[PDB]
Amino acid sequence: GLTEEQRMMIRELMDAQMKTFDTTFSHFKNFRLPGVEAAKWSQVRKDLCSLKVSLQLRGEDGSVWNYKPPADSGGKEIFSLLPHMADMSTYMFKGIISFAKVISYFRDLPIEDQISLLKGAAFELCQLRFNTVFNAETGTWECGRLSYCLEDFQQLLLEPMLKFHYMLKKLQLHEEEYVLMQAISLFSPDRPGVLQHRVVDQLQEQFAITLKSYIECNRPQPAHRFLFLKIMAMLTELRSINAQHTQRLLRIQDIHPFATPLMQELFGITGS
Ligand SMILES: O=[S@]1OC[C@@H]2[C@H](CO1)[C@]1(Cl)C(Cl)=C(Cl)[C@@]2(Cl)C1(Cl)Cl
Known part of the structure; x- marks a missing residue:
């Protein structure tokens, strides 16, 4: 029940997602692994310990490596998973950049609104992709041969990002709804340094209209009443999570440098 332009829009986004999301993480390799001012630390202490994960690697031969992280003993132990996380983030960010670059609406913006969108x-597009490999019953992100298992209840869902992943997973979205959420979020007319506000705003309104129409054509069940509005509220939450994670990343980077070159680019760090 979508117009021809709407069906075209979904097809192009589904196509860009198919080409740039390595859902089995086959091409993520060469990554680092964990080895074998007072109020600043307390804040970074608080920052890192809210999402503790164990790590699993399944070998191609049938072997398994498992990593249980240290307990908080007040020292540099809390940074042991950071270089690995930054390699995963970088790998995810590359996929996200390729996603944007293959979308015609994105390619037709000026190069400096692209970089700025x-x-x-x-971060938001990366979290949206990570929700699709998140297992809410085991508390696990299943990334191919890599697994990131949350670490022992519902106090765990006091961390807003964990609560976001569980709430988003409960909506049981289709692949099309996920990519439309990525578009609406990529084309946000109000990111720092956007110049073509009006063009980006019309594109966004239009990805939103397609999503509302998609839901109305394909989900008549009483369970998905107001589903479109739940998705828009989740996107608002994610924008907020996104700002909190940026501050926390800069606080950590301030006392313990870890960000990759691509992360420095995305977050304003100049290397000087
Ligand atoms: O790409 S980055 O590195 C991956 C980590 C974070 C996201 O940023 C979180 Cl929040 C998510 Cl999502 C996953 Cl998956 C993990 Cl493992 C946790 Cl720590 Cl749960």
């Missing part, structure tokens, strides 16, 4: 939304 990407800086605004890279």
